[PDB]
Amino acid sequence: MEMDKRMKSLAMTAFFGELSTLDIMALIMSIFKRHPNNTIFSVDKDGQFMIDFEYDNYKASQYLDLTLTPISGDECKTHASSIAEQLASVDIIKEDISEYIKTTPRLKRFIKKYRNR
Numbered sequence: 001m002e003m004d005k006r007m008k009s010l011a012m013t014a015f016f017g018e019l020s021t022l023d024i025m026a027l028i029m030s031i032f033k034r035h036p037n038n039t040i041f042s043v044d045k046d047g048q049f050m051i052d053f054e055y056d057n058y059k060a061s062q063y064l065d066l067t068l069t070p071i072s073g074d075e076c077k078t079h080a081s082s083i084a085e086q087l088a089s090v091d092i093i094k095e096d097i098s099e100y101i102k103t104t105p106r107l108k109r110f111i112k113k114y115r116n117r
Contacts, residue, residue, distance in 0.1 A: 003058045004032070006114065011063045014113055018106050022089050024060040025053045026107060029097050031114065036060070039090075041076075041083065042068040049079040051086045 007027065011019050019027075028034055036053035043049050044066060052068055053060040061068050071079065093100050101107045 001057060003062060007031070008063050010110060010114060012065065015106070015110055019064060019110075021050045021052055021060050021064065021066070022086060022093065023107065024063045025090070026093050026097065026100060026104075027110060027114075028053075028055075028060070029093070030101050030107070030111065040068075041071040041079075043071055043075060043079070044068055049075075049082040049086075051083075051090065 011024065025036060034055070036055060038054050040052040040054055040059070041049070042052045042061070049071070050061075050068070059068075076083075101111060
């Protein structure tokens with residue numbers, strides 16, 4: 001019944017602000033080989049759209065100390081564009097995680113910094 005302390009720390013310190021909600025979803029997959037139970041279309045304080053990812057008892061947005069409200073039907077038209085981008089990314093991620101990491105510098109770094117004795 002836990003969010004990994006090390007990851008949370010890295011996301012909030014060494015990578016503060018660099019990581020998106022999809023990023024976290026990716027890292028979790030890559031590092032813990034664990035997948036979301038489901039998806040949550042959502043939006044933040046400033047109204048930026050973002051897919052969130054629900055696990056056992058925590059959301060990916062929580063590794064980033066983020067406060068997201070679910071999306072309203074009315075908003076769904078406003079964000080159609082972003083919704084597509086992100087849905088795309090998720091597929092690319094789901095398709096070859098290993099490749100996605102190698103290809104995305106921020107994520108490669110994070111995996112490195114994550115593996116320190």
